[PDB]
């Protein structure tokens, strides 16, 4: 209770250090545009849902937009790999927003098979396909490349970070759709896996006037 109170500032901090992190130049991309989406679907669901807990209205519009966005990226990232060119989906910056805007109202005009099954039924395979056909390439590479020099293993971990974010939101909201507090847990797990996995590490940990390893 009064002990778990420290769990809200967690859904009001980590999700803001992120929104601001995105809102730096280099951090602005389609991927970090949808991950920055699950920020308002964790902060709003913490400064508007967690506090008072219309209250059951934004409780659905929040969780039905998550496993929906998770369905988005899983496909976006795919279209990025299946693509004949470089790794970075074609969803333009504006059409990412226009596509972003339509994920909320449809999340508002919205069921476990509509707002949960459907979005997780495909999202797990559109990604499965990906995490898989991302391996064939991973080393269809030149072995010599990297040891004699004179998509790579890096972007292979970027799908590891996006590979657990989609892999934690499943074991957190499944036992519920099959415990209502376990689902809230994925509110301080994303900005937590982004530290020891993706670039965010420095992006936001050093934004707080150089955290620690700032050549301390």
């Amino acid at each position, epitope marked *: 209770g009064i002990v778990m109170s420290l769990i809200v500032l967690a859904i009001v901090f980590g999700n803001v250090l992120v929104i601001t992190a995105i809102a730096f130049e280099r951090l602005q991309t389609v991927t970090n545009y949808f991950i920055t989406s699950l920020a308002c679907a964790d902060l709003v669901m913490g400064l508007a849902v967690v506090p008072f807990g219309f209250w059951t209205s934004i409780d659905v519009l929040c969780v039905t937009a998550s496993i929906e966005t998770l369905c988005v990226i899983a496909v976006d990232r795919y279209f990025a790999i299946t693509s004949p060119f470089k790794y970075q989906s074609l969803l333009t910056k504006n059409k990412a927003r226009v596509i972003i805007l339509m994920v909320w109202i449809v999340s508002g005009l919205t069921s476990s098979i509509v707002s949960f099954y459907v979005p997780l039924v495909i999202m797990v395979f559109v990604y499965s396909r990906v995490f898989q056909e991302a391996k064939r390439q991973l080393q269809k590479i030149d072995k010599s490349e*990297g*040891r004699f020099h004179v998509f790579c293993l*890096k972007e292979h971990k970027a799908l590891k970070t996006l590979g657990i974010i989609m892999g934690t939101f499943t074991l957190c909201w499944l036992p519920f759709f099959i415990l209502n507090w376990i689902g809230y847990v994925n509110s301080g797990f994303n900005p937590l896996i982004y530290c020891r996995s993706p670039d965010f590490r420095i992006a936001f940990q050093e934004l707080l006037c150089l955290r620690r390893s700032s050549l301390k």
Partner: antibody
Amino acid sequence: EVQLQQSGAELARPGASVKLSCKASGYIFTDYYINWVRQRTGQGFEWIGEIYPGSGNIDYNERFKDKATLTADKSSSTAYMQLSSLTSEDSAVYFCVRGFGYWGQGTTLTVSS
Amino acid sequence: DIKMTQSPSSMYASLGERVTITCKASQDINSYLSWFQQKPGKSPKTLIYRANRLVDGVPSRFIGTGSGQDYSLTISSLDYADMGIYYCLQYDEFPYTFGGGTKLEIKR
């Protein structure tokens, strides 16, 4: 001016654990993995594992699977190797290569009483 | 894992002649083989990789040429400083495995 610095001489009591370092300095650490190959006295080379500084991937050789644990330092631009429960036969020269291209100096580790 | 024999072992060539060691692996490494030289009192200096692609700095009289399952490092016009122990390495798959290296001496 390309080079991976090494200790050259390392003494350790049987059963203990040494931790060899390799300070590369003359290129971009994270652009080449770096393997650690052990070469006992006499002759012979036996790959202990390869760790890619840039990512994190550390493919160990079964044999030294549980024995050694590779690790890199993006800042220091130096890498390491953890060799636990050393034995009389773990003694030898340990090489820190840059993916078989440029070899290191060497560390004449010797497990002894 | 992947045995890789390497004849010869012992070898005596006199200056000027072209000496040659041949390496043949167990599997089929896609030319993912390399050749280096161990000199007494020194760390190994790599000469070739990708079965034939001379490393930068290695003298142009060194020549690696094999394919699929058998290769060979070779030098035309053996120079005096060319004395030591050359070994072949494959990095096609884990665990990387070394040859046994042949050793070459110069008849004086």
